[PDB]
Amino acid sequence: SEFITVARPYAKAAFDFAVEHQSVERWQDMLAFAAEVTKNEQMAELLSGALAPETLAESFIAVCGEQLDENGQNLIRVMAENGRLNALPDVLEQFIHLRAVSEAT
């Protein structure tokens, strides 16, 4: 039950500025740590709250840690607002490929 179609643009838009802001190297952890915590059962429990997007989004920013880019924190919210916060790995996988792409072209 993946949602790469939703992560395609989420990871793409975040990767663009990540390259312009030279954060790609540091952002790499932000995506990994973001996908690492979302894979935790308890994280899914908080993510699949009673129809509460701000609960899973804000709780994620707090559980993920303040070490998040302004686009990274907003990305989690935008993912929560659209009910796609669980698609953190879809964005991570797309980012890994996007990163490998820019390194070659």
From Swiss-Prot:
Broad class of the protein's primary localization: membrane
Domain of life: Bacteria
Location(s), subcellular: Cell inner membrane
Annotated signal sequence range: none
Keywords associated with the record: ATP synthesis, Cell inner membrane, Cell membrane, CF(1), Hydrogen ion transport, Ion transport, Membrane, Transport
GO process terms (BP): proton motive force-driven ATP synthesis; proton motive force-driven plasma membrane ATP synthesis
Keyword Flavoprotein: no
GO molecular function, one term: proton-transporting ATP synthase activity, rotational mechanism
GO cellular component: plasma membrane; proton-transporting ATP synthase complex
Lyase found in the keyword field: no
Membrane topology summary: Peripheral membrane protein
Role summary: F(1)F(0) ATP synthase produces ATP from ADP in the presence of a proton or sodium gradient. F-type ATPases consist of two structural domains, F(1) containing the extramembraneous catalytic core and F(0) containing the membrane proton channel, linked together by a central stalk and a peripheral stalk. During catalysis, ATP synthesis in the catalytic domain of F(1) is coupled via a rotary mechanism of the central stalk subunits to proton translocation.
Similarity comment: Belongs to the ATPase delta chain family.
Subunit structure: F-type ATPases have 2 components, F(1) - the catalytic core - and F(0) - the membrane proton channel. F(1) has five subunits: alpha(3), beta(3), gamma(1), delta(1), epsilon(1). F(0) has three main subunits: a(1), b(2) and c(10-14). The alpha and beta chains form an alternating ring which encloses part of the gamma chain. F(1) is attached to F(0) by a central stalk formed by the gamma and epsilon chains, while a peripheral stalk is formed by the delta and b chains.
The protein's name: ATP synthase subunit delta
Classification of source organism: Bacteria, Pseudomonadati, Pseudomonadota, Gammaproteobacteria, Enterobacterales
Gene: atpH
